Coordinates of C-alpha atoms and ligand atoms in Angstrom, one line a residue:
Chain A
X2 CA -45.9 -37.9 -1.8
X3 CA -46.1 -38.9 1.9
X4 CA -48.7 -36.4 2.9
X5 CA -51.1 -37.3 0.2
X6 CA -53.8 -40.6 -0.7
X7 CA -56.0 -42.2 -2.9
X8 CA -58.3 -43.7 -0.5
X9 CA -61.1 -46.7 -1.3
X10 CA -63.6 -48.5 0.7
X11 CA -64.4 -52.2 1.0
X12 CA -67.2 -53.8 3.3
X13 CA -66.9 -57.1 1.6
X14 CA -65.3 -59.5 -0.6
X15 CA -67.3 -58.5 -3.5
X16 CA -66.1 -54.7 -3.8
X17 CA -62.8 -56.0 -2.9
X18 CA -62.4 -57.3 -6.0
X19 CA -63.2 -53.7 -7.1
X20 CA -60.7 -52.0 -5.0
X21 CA -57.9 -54.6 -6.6
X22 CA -59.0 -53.6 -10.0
X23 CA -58.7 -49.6 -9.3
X24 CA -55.7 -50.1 -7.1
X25 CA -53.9 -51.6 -10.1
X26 CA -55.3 -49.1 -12.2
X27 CA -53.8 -46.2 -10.5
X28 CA -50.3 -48.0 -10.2
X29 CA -50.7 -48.1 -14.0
X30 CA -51.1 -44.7 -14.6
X31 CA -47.8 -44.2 -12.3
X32 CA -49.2 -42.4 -9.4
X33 CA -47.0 -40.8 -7.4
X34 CA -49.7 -40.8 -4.2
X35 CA -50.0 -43.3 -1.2
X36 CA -53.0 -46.1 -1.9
X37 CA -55.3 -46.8 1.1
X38 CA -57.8 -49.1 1.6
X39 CA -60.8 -48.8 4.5
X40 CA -61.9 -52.0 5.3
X41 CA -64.5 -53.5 8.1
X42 CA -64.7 -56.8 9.7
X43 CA -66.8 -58.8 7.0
X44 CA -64.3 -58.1 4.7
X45 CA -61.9 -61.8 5.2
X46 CA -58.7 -62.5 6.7
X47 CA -57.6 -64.1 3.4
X48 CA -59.3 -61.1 1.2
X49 CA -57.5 -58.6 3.7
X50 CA -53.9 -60.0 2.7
X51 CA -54.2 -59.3 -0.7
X52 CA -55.4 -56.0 -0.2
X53 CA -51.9 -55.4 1.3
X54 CA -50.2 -56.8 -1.7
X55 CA -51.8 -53.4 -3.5
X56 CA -52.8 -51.3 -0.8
X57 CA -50.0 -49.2 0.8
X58 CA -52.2 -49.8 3.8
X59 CA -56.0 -51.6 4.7
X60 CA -57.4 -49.3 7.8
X61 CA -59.5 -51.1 9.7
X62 CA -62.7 -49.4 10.3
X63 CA -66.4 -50.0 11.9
X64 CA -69.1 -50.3 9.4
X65 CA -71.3 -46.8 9.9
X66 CA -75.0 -48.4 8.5
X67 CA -77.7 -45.1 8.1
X68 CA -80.2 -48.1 8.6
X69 CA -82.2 -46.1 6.6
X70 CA -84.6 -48.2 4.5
X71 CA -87.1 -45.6 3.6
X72 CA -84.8 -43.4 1.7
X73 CA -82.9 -46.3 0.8
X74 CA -86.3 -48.0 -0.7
X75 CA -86.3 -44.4 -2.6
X76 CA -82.8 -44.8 -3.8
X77 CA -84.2 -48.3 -5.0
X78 CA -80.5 -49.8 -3.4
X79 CA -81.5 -51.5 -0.1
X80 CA -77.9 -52.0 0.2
X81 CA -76.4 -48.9 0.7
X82 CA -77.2 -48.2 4.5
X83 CA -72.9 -48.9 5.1
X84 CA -71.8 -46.7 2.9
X85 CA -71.9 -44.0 5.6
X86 CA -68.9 -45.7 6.5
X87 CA -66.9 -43.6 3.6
X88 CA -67.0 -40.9 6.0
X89 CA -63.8 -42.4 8.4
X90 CA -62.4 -40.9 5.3
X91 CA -61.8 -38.1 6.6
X92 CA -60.7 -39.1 10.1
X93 CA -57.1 -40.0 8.1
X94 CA -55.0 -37.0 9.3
X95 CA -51.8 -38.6 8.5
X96 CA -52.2 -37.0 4.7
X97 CA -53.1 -33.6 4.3
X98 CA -55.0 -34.0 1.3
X99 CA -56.7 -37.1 -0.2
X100 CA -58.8 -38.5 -3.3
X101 CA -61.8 -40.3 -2.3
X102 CA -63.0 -42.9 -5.1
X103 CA -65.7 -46.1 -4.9
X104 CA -64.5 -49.4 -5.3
X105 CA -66.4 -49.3 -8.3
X106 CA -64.3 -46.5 -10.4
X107 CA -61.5 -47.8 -12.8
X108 CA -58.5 -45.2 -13.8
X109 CA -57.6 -44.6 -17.4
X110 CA -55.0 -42.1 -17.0
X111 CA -52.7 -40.4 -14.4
X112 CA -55.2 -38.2 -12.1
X113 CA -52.8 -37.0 -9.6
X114 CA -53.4 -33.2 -10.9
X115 CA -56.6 -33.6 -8.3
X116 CA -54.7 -33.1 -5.7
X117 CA -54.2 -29.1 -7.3
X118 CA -58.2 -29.4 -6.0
X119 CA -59.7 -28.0 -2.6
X120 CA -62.1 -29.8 -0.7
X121 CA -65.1 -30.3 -1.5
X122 CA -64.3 -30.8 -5.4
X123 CA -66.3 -33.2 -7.0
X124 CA -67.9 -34.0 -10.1
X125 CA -71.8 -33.7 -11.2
X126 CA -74.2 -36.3 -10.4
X127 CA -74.9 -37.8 -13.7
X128 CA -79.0 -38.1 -12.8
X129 CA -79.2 -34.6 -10.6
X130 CA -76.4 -32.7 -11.6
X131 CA -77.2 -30.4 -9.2
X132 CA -75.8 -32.8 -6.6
X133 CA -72.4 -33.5 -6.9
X134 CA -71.7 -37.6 -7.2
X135 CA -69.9 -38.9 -4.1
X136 CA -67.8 -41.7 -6.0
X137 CA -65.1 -39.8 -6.8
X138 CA -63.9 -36.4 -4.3
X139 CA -61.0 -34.3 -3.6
X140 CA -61.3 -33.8 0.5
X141 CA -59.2 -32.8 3.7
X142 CA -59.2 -34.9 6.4
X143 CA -59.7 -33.1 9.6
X144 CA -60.8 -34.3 13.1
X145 CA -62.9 -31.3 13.2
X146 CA -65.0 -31.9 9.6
X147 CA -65.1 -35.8 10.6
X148 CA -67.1 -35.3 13.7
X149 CA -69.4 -33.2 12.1
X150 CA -70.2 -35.2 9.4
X151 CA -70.5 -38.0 12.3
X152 CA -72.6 -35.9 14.0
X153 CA -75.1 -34.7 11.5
X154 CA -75.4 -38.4 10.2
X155 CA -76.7 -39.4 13.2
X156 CA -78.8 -36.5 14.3
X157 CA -80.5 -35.7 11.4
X158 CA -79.5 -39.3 8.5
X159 CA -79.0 -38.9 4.6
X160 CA -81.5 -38.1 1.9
X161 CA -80.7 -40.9 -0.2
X162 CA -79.6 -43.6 3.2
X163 CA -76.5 -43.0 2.1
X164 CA -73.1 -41.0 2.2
X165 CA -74.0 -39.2 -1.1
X166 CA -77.2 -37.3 0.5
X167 CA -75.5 -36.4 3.7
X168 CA -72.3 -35.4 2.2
X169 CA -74.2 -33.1 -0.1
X170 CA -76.2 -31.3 2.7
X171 CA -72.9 -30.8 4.6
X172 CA -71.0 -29.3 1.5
X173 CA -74.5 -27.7 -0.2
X174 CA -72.6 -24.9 -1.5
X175 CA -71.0 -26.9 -4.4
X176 CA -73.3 -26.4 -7.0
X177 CA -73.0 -22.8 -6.7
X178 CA -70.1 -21.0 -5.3
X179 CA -66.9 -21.5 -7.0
X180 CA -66.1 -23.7 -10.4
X181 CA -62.9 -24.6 -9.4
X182 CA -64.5 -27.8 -7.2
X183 CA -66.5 -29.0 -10.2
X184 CA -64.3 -31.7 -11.5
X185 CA -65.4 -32.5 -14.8
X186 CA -67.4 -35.4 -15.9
X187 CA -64.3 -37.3 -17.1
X188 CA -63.0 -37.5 -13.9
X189 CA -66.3 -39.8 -13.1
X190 CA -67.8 -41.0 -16.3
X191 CA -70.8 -42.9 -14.1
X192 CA -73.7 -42.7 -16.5
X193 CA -72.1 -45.6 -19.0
X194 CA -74.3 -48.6 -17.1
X195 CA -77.7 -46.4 -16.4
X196 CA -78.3 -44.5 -19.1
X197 CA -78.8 -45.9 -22.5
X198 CA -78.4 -42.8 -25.2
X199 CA -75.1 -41.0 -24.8
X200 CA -74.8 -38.9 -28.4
X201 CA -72.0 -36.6 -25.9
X202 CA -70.0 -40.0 -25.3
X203 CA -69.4 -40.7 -28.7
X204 CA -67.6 -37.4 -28.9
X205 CA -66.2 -36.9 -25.8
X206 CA -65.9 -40.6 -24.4
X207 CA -62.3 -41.5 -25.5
X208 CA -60.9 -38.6 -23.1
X209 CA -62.5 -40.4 -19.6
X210 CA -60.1 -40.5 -17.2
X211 CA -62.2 -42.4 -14.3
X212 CA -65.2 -44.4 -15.1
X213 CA -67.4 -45.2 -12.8
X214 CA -69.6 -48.6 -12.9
X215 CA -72.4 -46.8 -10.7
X216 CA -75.7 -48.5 -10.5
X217 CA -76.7 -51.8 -9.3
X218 CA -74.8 -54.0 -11.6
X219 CA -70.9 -54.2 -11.0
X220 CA -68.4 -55.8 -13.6
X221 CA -67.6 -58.5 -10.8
X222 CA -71.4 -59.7 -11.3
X223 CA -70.9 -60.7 -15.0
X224 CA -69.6 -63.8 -16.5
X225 CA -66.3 -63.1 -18.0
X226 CA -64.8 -66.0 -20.4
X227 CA -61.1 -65.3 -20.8
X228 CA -60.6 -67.4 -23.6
X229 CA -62.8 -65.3 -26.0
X230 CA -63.0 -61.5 -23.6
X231 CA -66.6 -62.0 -24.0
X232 CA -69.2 -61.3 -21.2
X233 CA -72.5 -63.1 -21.1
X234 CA -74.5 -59.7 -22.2
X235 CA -77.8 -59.7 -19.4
X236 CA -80.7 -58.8 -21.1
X237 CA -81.3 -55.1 -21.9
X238 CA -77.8 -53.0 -20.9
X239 CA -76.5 -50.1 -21.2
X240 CA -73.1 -51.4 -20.7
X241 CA -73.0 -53.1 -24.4
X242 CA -73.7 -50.4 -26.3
X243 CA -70.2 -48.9 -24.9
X244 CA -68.5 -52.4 -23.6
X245 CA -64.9 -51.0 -24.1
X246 CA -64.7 -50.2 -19.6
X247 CA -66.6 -53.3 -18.9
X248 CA -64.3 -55.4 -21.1
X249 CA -60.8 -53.4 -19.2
X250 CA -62.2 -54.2 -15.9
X251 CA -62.1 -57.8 -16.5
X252 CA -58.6 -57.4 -18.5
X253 CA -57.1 -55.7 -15.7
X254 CA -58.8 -58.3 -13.7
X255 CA -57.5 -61.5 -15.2
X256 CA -54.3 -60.2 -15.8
X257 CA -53.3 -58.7 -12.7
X258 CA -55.4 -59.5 -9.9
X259 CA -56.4 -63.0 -9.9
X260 CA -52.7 -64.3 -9.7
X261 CA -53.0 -62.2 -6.0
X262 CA -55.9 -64.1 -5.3
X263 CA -54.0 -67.1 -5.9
Chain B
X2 CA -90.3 -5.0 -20.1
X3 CA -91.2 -5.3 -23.9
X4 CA -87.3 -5.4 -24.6
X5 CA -87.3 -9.2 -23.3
X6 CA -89.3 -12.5 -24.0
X7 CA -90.1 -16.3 -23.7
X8 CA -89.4 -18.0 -27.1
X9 CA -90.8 -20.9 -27.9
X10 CA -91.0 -23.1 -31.4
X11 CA -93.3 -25.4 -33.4
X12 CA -92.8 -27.0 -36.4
X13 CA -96.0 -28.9 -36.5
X14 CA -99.8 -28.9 -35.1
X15 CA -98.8 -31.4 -32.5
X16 CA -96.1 -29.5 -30.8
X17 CA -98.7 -26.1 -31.2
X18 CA -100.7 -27.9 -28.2
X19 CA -97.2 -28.1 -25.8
X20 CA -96.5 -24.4 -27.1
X21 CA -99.9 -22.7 -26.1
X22 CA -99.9 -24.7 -22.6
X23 CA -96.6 -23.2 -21.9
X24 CA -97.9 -20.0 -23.3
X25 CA -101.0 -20.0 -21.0
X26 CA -98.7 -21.0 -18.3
X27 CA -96.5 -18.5 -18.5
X28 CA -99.5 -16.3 -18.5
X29 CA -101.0 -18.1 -15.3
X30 CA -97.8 -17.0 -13.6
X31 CA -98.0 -13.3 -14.2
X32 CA -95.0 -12.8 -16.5
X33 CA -94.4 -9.4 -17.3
X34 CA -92.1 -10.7 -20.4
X35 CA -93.2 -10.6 -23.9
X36 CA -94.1 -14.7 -25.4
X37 CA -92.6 -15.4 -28.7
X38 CA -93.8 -18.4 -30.9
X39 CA -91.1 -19.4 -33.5
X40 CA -93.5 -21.5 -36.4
X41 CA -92.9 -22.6 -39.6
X42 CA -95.1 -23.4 -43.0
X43 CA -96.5 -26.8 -41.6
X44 CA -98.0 -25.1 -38.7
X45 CA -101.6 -24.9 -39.8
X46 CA -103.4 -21.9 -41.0
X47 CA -105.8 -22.0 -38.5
X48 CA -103.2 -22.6 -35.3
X49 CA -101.3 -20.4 -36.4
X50 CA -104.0 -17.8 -35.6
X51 CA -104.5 -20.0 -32.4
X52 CA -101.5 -19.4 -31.5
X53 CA -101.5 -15.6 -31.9
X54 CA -104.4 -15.8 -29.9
X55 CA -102.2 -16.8 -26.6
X56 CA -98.7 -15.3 -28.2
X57 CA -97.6 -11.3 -28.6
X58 CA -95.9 -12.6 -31.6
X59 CA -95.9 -15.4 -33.9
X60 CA -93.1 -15.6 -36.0
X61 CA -92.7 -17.4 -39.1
X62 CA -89.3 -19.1 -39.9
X63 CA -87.9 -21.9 -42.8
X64 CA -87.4 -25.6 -40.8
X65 CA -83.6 -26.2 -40.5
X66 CA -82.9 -29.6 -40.4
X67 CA -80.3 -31.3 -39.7
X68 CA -80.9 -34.6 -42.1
X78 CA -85.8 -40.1 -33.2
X79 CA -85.9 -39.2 -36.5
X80 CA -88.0 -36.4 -35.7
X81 CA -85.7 -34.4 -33.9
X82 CA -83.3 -33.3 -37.1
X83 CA -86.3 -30.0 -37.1
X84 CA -85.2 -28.9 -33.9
X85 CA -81.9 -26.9 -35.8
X86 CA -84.6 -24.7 -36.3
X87 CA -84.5 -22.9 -33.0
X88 CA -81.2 -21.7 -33.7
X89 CA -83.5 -18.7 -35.8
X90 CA -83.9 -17.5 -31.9
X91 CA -80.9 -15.3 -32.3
X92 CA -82.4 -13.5 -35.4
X93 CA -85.2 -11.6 -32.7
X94 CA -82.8 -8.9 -32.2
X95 CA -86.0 -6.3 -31.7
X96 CA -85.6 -8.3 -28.4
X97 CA -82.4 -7.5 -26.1
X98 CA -82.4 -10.5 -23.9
X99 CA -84.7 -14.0 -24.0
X100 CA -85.1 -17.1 -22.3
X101 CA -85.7 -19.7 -25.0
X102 CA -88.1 -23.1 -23.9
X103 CA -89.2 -26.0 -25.8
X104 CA -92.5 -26.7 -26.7
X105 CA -92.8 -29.4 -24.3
X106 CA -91.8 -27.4 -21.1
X107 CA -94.7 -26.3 -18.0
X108 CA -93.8 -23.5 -15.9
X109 CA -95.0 -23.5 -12.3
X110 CA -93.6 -20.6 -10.7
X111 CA -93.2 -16.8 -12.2
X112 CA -89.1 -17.5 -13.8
X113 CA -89.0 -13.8 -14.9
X114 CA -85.7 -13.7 -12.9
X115 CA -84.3 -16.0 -15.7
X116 CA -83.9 -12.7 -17.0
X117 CA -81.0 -11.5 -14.2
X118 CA -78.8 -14.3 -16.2
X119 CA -76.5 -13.6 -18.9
X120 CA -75.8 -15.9 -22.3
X121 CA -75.7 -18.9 -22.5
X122 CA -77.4 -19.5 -19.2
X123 CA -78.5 -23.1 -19.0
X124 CA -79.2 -26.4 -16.5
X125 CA -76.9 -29.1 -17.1
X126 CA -78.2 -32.4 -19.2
X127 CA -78.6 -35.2 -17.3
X128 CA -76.3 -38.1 -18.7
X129 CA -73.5 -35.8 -19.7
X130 CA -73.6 -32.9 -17.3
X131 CA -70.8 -31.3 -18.8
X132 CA -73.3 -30.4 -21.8
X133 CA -76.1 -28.0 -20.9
X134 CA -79.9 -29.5 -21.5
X135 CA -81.1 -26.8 -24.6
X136 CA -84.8 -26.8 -23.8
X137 CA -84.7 -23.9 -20.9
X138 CA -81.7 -21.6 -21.9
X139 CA -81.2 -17.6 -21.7
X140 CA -79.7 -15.7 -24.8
X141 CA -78.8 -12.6 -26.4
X142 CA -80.4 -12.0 -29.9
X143 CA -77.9 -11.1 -32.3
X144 CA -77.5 -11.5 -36.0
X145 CA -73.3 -11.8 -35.6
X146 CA -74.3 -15.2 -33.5
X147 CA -77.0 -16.1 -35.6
X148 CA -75.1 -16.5 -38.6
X149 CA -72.4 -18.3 -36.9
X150 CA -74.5 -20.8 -35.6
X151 CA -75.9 -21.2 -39.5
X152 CA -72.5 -21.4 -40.3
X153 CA -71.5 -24.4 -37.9
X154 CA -74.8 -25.9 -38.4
X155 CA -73.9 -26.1 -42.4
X156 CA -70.6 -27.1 -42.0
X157 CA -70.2 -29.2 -39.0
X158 CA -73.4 -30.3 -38.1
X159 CA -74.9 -31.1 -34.8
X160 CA -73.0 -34.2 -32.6
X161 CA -76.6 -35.5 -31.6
X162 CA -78.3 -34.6 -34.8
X163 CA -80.3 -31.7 -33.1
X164 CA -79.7 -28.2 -31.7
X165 CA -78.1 -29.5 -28.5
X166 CA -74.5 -30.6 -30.3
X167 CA -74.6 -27.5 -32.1
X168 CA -75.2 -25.3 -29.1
X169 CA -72.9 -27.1 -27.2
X170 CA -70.1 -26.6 -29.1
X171 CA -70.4 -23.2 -29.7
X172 CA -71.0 -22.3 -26.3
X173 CA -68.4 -25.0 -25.3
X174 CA -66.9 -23.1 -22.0
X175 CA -70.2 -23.4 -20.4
X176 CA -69.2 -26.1 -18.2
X177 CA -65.9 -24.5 -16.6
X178 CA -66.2 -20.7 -17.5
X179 CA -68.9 -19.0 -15.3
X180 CA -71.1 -20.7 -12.2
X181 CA -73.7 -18.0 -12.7
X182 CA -74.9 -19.4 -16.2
X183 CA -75.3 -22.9 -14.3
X184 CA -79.2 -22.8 -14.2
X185 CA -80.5 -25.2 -11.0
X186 CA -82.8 -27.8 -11.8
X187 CA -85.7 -25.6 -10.6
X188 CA -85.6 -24.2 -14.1
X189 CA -85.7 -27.5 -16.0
X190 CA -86.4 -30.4 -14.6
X191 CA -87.1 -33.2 -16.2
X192 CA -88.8 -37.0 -15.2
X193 CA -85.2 -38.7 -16.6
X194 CA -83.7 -37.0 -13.4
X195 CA -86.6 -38.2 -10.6
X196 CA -86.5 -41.3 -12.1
X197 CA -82.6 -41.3 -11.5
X198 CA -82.3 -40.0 -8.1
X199 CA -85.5 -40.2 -6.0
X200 CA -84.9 -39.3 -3.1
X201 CA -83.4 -36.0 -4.2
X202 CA -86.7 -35.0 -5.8
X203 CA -88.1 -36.3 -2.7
X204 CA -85.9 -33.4 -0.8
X205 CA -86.1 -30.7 -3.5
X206 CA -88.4 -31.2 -5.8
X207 CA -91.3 -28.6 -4.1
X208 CA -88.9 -26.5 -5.3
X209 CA -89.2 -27.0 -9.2
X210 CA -90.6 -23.7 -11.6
X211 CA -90.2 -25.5 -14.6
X212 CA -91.7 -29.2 -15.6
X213 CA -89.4 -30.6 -18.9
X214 CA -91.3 -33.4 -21.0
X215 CA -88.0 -34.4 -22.2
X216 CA -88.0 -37.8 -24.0
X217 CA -90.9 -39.4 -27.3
X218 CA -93.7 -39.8 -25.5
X219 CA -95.2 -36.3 -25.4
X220 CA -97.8 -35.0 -22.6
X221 CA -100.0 -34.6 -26.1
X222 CA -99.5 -38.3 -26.8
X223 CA -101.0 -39.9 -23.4
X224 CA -104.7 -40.6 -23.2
X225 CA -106.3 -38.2 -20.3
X226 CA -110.0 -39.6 -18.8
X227 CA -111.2 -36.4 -17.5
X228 CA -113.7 -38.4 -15.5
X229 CA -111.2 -40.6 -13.6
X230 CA -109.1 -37.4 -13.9
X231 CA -106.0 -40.2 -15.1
X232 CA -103.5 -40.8 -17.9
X233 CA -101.9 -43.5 -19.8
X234 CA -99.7 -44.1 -23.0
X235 CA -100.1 -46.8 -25.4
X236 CA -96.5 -46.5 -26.0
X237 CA -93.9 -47.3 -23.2
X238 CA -93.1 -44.4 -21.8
X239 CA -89.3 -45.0 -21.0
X240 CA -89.0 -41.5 -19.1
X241 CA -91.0 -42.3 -16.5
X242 CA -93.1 -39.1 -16.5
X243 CA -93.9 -38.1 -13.2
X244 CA -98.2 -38.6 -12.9
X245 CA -98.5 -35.5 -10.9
X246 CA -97.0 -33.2 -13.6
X247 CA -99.0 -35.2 -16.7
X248 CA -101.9 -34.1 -15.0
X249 CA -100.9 -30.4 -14.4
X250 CA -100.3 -30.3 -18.1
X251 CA -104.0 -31.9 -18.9
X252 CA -105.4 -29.7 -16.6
X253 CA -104.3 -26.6 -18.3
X254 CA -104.6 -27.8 -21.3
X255 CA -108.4 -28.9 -20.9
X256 CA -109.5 -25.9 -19.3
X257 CA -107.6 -22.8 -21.3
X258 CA -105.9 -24.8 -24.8
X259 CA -108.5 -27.9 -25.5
X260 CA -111.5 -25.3 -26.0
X261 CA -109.7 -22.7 -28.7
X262 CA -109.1 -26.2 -30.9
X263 CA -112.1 -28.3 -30.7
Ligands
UDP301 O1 -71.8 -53.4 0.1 C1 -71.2 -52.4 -0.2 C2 -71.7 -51.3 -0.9 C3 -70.9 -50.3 -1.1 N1 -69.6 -50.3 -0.7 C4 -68.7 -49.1 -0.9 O2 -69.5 -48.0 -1.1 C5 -69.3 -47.5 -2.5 C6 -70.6 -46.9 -2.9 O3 -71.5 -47.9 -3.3 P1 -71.8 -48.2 -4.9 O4 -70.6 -47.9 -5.8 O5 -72.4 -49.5 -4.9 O6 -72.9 -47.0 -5.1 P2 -73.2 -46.4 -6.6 O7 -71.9 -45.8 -7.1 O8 -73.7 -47.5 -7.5 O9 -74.3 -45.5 -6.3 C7 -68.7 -48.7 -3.2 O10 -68.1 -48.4 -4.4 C8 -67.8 -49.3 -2.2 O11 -66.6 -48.5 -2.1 C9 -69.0 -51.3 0.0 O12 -67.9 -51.4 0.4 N2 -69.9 -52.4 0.2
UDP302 O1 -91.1 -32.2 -34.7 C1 -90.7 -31.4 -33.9 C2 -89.7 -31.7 -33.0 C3 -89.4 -30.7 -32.0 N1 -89.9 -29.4 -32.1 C4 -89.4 -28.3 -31.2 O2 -88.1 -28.5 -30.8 C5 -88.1 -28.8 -29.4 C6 -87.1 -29.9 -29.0 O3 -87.6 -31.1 -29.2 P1 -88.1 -32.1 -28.0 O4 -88.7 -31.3 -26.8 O5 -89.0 -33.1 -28.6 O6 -86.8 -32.8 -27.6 P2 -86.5 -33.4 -26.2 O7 -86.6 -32.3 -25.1 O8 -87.5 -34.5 -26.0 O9 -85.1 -34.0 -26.3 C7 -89.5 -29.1 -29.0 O10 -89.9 -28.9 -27.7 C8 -90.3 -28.1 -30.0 O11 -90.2 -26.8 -29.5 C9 -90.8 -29.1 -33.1 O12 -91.3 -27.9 -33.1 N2 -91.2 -30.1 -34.0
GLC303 O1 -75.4 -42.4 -1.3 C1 -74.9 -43.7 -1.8 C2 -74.1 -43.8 -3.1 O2 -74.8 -43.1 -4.2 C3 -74.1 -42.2 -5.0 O3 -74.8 -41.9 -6.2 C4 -72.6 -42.6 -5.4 O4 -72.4 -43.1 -6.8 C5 -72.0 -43.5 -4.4 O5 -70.6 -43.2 -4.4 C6 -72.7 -43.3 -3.1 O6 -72.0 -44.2 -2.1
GLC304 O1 -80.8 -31.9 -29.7 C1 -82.0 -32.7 -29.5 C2 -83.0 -32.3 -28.4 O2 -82.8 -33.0 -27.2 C3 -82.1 -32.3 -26.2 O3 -81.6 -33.2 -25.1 C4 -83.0 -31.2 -25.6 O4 -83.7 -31.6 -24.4 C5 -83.9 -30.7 -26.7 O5 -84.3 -29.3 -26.4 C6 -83.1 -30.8 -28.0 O6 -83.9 -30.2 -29.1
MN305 MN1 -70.0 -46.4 -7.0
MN306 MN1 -88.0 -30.9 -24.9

């Protein structure tokens, strides 16, 4: 209502363009939650603007970088080091509740029964299932759980260089304890773009509710011609063989972001 | 106890070599389980006794087949639920390695199971724990006839009849230490990196078989003519060739 967020992140331009495209997609779907945006400095005066024309608020926040290349060099996405940044998340105390999702998810229905979820749910990692994926989480922000997860990022880092490994160690007993904090897989459909066989999406794909573009390519890093709603298809991808989320990103896109880019 | 086994299934003399490593495996590891072999008609005469060699039973069933082209046989491990002299078992593909004694797979209940990479609201069929029963057996020929399988194989079918795996009961969520496969390293590193010590089970998952790369036992090496698009992790290639040299390699040639 009040009390309770979606909340995004944006270090840049780039996954701006992102947190437009899911911001619009959850006033689609006729949320009835606040929309937040955390954003750091790199992110531009001109790009910040616009995030307030979607954003019920952009938070301004330090970048938090693991600096972790090693396990980032593992996680093959040298990149990643800021996305320990996702963890101010949780230093927002003015909602009791809040949905954390990446830049890089898109909404495809009304998701707002989440917020029936406890902290820590979240759905399976779609490469370790074991781990749950960090792109999409039901959490409650607390000063208390903020300073830990402050705290054991910098005493003892992430896994993976990012907030996925760290955010598993904290809540470890997820894959175990109690159902109720899987989500399922529709709620973050994040294998589309990485893995190239799906026999289960063909039956069970038209239901997704999120998906999740995770992975090194993002839709923003195609060609998009609006005349014909093609996209220049980049060599071998796993995004063609199901383009149907690919080609709603850039509809959503075209339609209602770029005139706020204007 | 000899109430409970390992079942296992091949339909051909190329899957028989993944069988008896697992077999020997399993035997390495000081299971105190009964090991199963499921094999049909195209089995050899000769492996067949081979297999009963490393196997308490060997147990010949028709092929199901559903109709990787390969993979329409694998409907034929759905005759695991006819073993009913056999009051719990944890069934394991012919490509599977254990590492670790698992004989606490038995503590689970059916249908125990890892989730499947890709779609982890499915269950991965080649590690799984069952109850025999000809009542299930003969719905699972039933849905096989008249629905089919989703993916062409046992997986669909499995999946759909056991389709409140995914939200019913944590306890038949099997961790990856029971089926791991090379898909999921190659996925997330740096989790493997973290947990992967931990891993009783080695899953071959994917064409290219540990049967189908070349091993130099002089350079003590492997490689594939075919692209292996799995990734599968060296280490565990060689703790397949190594058991299969020394305890499978001499019973065949
Ligand atoms: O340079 C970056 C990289 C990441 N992110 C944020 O961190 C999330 C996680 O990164 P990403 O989605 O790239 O990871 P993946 O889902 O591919 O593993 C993004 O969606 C953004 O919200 C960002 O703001 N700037
Ligand atoms: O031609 C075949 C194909 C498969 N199988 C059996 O069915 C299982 C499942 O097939 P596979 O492991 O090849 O599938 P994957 O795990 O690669 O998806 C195998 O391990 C074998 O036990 C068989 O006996 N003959
Ligand atoms: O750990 C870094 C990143 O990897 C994860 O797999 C998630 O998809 C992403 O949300 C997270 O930021
Ligand atoms: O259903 C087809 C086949 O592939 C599946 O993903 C499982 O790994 C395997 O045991 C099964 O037989
Ligand atoms: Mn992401
Ligand atoms: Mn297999």
């Amino acid at each position: 209502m009040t009390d309770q967020a979606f909340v995004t992140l944006t270090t840049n331009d780039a996954y701006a363009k992102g947190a437009l495209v899911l911001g619009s997609s959850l006033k689609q779907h006729r949320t009835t939650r606040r929309l937040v945006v955390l954003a750091t400095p790199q992110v531009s005066d001109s790009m910040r603007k616009v995030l307030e024309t979607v954003f019920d608020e952009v938070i301004m926040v330090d970048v938090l970088d693991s600096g972790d290349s090693a396990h980032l060099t593992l996680m093959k996405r040298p990149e990643l080091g800021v996305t320990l940044t996702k963890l101010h998340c949780w230093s927002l105390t003015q909602y009791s509740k809040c949905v954390f999702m990446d830049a890089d998810t898109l909404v495809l229905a009304n998701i707002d029964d989440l917020f029936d979820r406890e902290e820590l749910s979240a759905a399976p990692d779609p490469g370790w299932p074991d781990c749950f994926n960090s792109g999409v989480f039901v959490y409650q922000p607390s000063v208390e759980t903020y300073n830990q997860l402050l705290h054991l990022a910098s005493e003892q880092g992430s896994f993976d260089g990012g907030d996925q490994g760290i955010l598993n160690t904290f809540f470890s007993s997820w894959a175990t304890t109690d159902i109720r904090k899987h989500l399922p897989f529709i709620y973050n459909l994040s294998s589309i773009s990485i893995f190239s066989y799906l026999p289960a999406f063909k039956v069970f794909g038209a239901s997704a509710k999120v998906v999740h573009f995770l992975g090194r390519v993002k839709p923003w890093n195609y060609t998009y011609d609006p005349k014909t709603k093609s996209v220049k298809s980049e060599a071998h991808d796993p995004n063609m063989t199901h383009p149907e989320f690919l080609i709603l990103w850039w509809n959503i896109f075209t339609t209602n972001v770029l005139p706020l880019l204007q």
